[PDB]
């Protein structure tokens, strides 16, 4: 389940399509509790690109219901990323997570 909460401002028409690369600031955090990444530490803004499950399902599908310039909060269920397995060491089993994620793409 993907849970869009928008940060308004973009202009609400361009939108993310097959073989597009973007430009996302994303930044994870876990819920009742810490950060677990971000990509403005490292200034390297993730330049991946759409429909070819290198990022989870939770990540993609919320890619697609953005536009240029706004800035969602996604909320993602376990079954899409990581609830069975689990990342080792840092995602835990059966783990809710949420992401402030930035959409300034190109192409």
């Given at each position: 389940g993907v849970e869009i909460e928008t940060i308004s401002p973009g202009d609400g028409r361009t939108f993310p399509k097959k073989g597009q690369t973007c430009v996302v600031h994303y930044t994870g955090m876990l819920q009742n509790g810490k950060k677990f990444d971000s990509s403005r530490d490292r200034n390297k803004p993730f330049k991946f690109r759409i429909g070819?499950?290198?990022?989870i399902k939770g990540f993609e599908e919320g890619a697609a219901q953005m536009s240029l310039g706004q800035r969602a909060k996604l909320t993602c269920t376990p079954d899409v990323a990581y609830?069975?397995?689990?990342?080792?060491?840092?995602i835990p089993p059966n783990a809710t997570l949420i992401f402030d994620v930035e959409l300034l793409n190109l192409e």
């Open positions: 070819k499950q290198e990022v609830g069975a397995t689990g990342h080792p060491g840092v």
